[PDB]
A paper describes a structure:
Indeed, LC-MS/MS analysis (data not shown) of the excised bands suggested that two unique CTL0886FL domains were present spanning residues 94–334 (CTL0886N) and residues 353–651 (CTL0886C). While equally poor diffraction was initially obtained with CTL0886C crystals, reductive methylation of surface exposed lysines enabled the growth of cubic crystals that diffracted synchrotron X-rays to 1.90 Å resolution. The structure of CTL0886C was determined using selenomethionine-labeled recombinant protein (also dimethylated) by Se-SAD and refined against the native high-resolution dataset. The final model is comprised of a single polypeptide in the asymmetric unit, 1 sulfate anion and 98 water molecules. The CTL0886C structure is comprised of 13 α-helices spanning two separate domains. Domain 1 consists of helices α1–7 arranged in a 7 helix bundle (residues 353–517). Helices α8–13 of domain 2 adopt an intertwined, globular fold with the later 3 helices (α11–13) wrapping around helices α8–10. Upon inspection of the 2Fo-Fc electron density map, four lysine residues (446, 463, 490, and 579) were modeled as dimethyl-lysine. For domain 1, each of these structures (as well as the next 10 scoring hits) are all members of the polyprenyl transferase (PTS) family. CTL0886C domain 1 is, however, lacking several α-helices typically found within the PTS family, including those involved in dimerization and extended regions typically found within the active site of PTS family enzymes (e.g., Asp-rich motifs).
In this report, we show the hypothetical protein CT622, which had previously been detected in the host cell cytosol is a T3S effector and we identify a novel putative chaperone protein for this effector. Our results converge to identify CT622 as a secreted protein that plays multiple and crucial roles in the initiation and support of the C. trachomatis growth cycle. In order to gain more insights into the molecular mechanism of CT622 function during Chlamydia infection, we undertook a structural analysis of CTL0886, the CT622 ortholog in the strain C. trachomatis L2 434/Bu. CT622 is the first chlamydial effector identified to date whose genetic disruption has such a strong impact on bacterial development in cell culture, without being fully lethal.
Residue numbers in the entry: 353 to 427, 430 to 522, 531 to 589, 598 to 650
Write the structure that this text describes.
């Protein structure tokens, strides 16, 4: 009876290819369906057979994915819950601790829940906000994690971030429009929001810095951030024009950053959700 944290490379790649094959069975751009859930099950069984044989005992983490897919067929939360269990398993294969696999699972599951949220939902803004918190948490964890946990994160989170988006004086409103203008997917939104977040963080941490230095440092940070990079650099340059261009703009940006930064980013998220939702 096999334990996933104690697998050889051939079986690690078998498992991960099975997870990748499950992922190809759905389309995040439309509500999840019985057919997709069933197809994921068929891919899971094909990989399980390779792992332990048509009759061997399923490892705990594969058991969990099976249970999850079973429930989702009986009743969005369903596919999202199953993909969190996929990300847990993949994280365990990669040598992650229980705590790490748990964090990966909770936060990947959230990205799918955000991907499947309708823009008309009363909870859409919330879901967009929760999805950014999950994004950040995953990017933090990615950096400090073993390679296989990195693969578990990116391979399960990316499909949710691929969800398409499209649009329907105040700085937070101006930032929202700038992010949205340059974004096709949810991943585009969050990666560009993170650039703004980093711009604000750079100002706070370097209050004496002028425009050129702020941008120099931000550029370095974007180069050192976890994983298109040229596109985020180009986006940084677009933020420069809006919020760092000249002494007046910088002074405005410095007030928001020193005095309001979390509130500002959450107001930006509200305004981004408004642009996708049409609602105030």
């Amino acid at each position: 009876s096999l334990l996933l944290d104690d697998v050889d490379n051939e079986m690690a790649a078998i498992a991960m290819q099975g997870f990748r094959s499950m992922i190809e069975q759905f389309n995040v751009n439309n509500p999840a369906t019985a057919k997709e859930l069933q197809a994921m099950e068929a891919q899971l069984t094909a990989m399980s057979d390779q792992l332990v044989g048509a009759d061997g005992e399923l490892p705990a983490e594969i058991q969990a994915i099976k249970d999850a897919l079973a429930q989702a067929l009986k009743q969005a939360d369903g596919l999202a819950t199953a993909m969190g269990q996929v990300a847990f398993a993949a994280a365990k294969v990669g040598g992650g601790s229980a705590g790490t696999a748990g964090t990966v699972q909770m936060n990947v599951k959230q990205l799918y829940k955000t991907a499947f949220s309708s823009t008309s939902s009363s909870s859409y803004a919330a879901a967009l906000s929760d999805g950014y918190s999950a994004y950040k948490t995953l990017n933090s964890l990615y950096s400090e994690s073993r390679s296989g946990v990195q693969s578990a994160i990116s391979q399960t989170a990316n499909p949710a971030l691929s969800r398409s988006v499209s649009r329907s004086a105040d700085a937070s409103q101006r930032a929202a429009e700038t992010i949205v203008r340059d974004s096709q997917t949810l991943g585009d939104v969050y990666s560009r929001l993170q650039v703004l977040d980093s711009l604000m963080s750079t100002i706070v941490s370097n209050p004496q810095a002028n425009q050129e230095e702020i941008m120099q440092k931000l550029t370095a940070s974007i180069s050192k951030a976890p994983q298109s990079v040229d596109s985020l650099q180009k986006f940084a340059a677009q933020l420069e024009r809006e919020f760092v261009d000249g002494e007046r703009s910088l002074a405005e940006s410095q007030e928001n950053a020193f005095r309001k930064q979390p509130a500002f980013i959450q107001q930006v998220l509200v305004n981004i959700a408004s642009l996708f939702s049409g609602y105030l």
